[PDB]
Amino acid sequence: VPISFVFNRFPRMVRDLAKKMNKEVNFIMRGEDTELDRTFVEEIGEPLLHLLRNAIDHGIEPKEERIAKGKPPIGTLILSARHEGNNVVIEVEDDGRGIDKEKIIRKAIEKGLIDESKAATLSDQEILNFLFVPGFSGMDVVKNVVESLNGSISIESEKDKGTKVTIRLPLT
Ligand SMILES: Nc1ncc2c(n1)CCCC2=O
């Protein structure tokens, strides 16, 4: 089943959200011929739509803010699919404001999930994986779907640079 069956509905959703949110977004899709099982195609749309929404709302900054920070004025959102062996890898990348890891740590300490003492030596992945804790901010819901497809998800993010969410699906 080509993934384009899912990806083809996204330019409309992205442009509707950009408009309602007053962002300017350059949306690029790559790898849309990538084939995978019908069950995956039927289920992956919801979690991707959530990731695209997060990027437009929380990641990409309004154009005035990007200019004020010396970034290219219009933010860019790239959705990509490819094969890596017998697995399909889907990426959602934006060049927005990124995730503030300090805020994550503060929030985790408030919620009683980590000691201040242990926050100093947390890895980058340890910190960002708090976002998957249920009720932390829902990245939990994204992970729940990916998990039910026997996939995995990771986040990479750096403040002011942007965010890349990666989803790895088995052949099934
Ligand atoms: N793409 C993207 N960029 C920023 C953020 C998110 N996703 C979700 C967490 C909140 C946040 O700040």
Q: Is the CB of 99 under 6 A from ligand 1?
A: yes
Half-sphere exposure of 121 (CA within 13 A, CB side): 2
How far is Cα 171 from Cα 130, in angstroms, rounded to an integer? 28
Q: How was this structure determined?
A: X-ray
Measured in Å, residue 4 CA sits from the centre of ligand 1 at 25
The stretches of the chain forming alpha helices (DSSP H) are 4-7, 10-21, 38-43, 45-54, 63-68, 101-110, 116-119, 124-129, 139-148
Amino acid identity, residue 142?
V
Query: How far lies 157's CA from each of 8, 69, 110, 126, 154, in Å?
Result: 26, 18, 22, 12, 10
Measured in Å, residue 53 CA sits from the centre of ligand 1 at 9
Measured in Å, residue 170 CA sits from the centre of ligand 1 at 26
The experimental resolution of this structure, in angstroms, equals 1.9
CATH 3.30.470.20 fits 1-172, yes or no: no
Structure tokens at 42: 């039927």
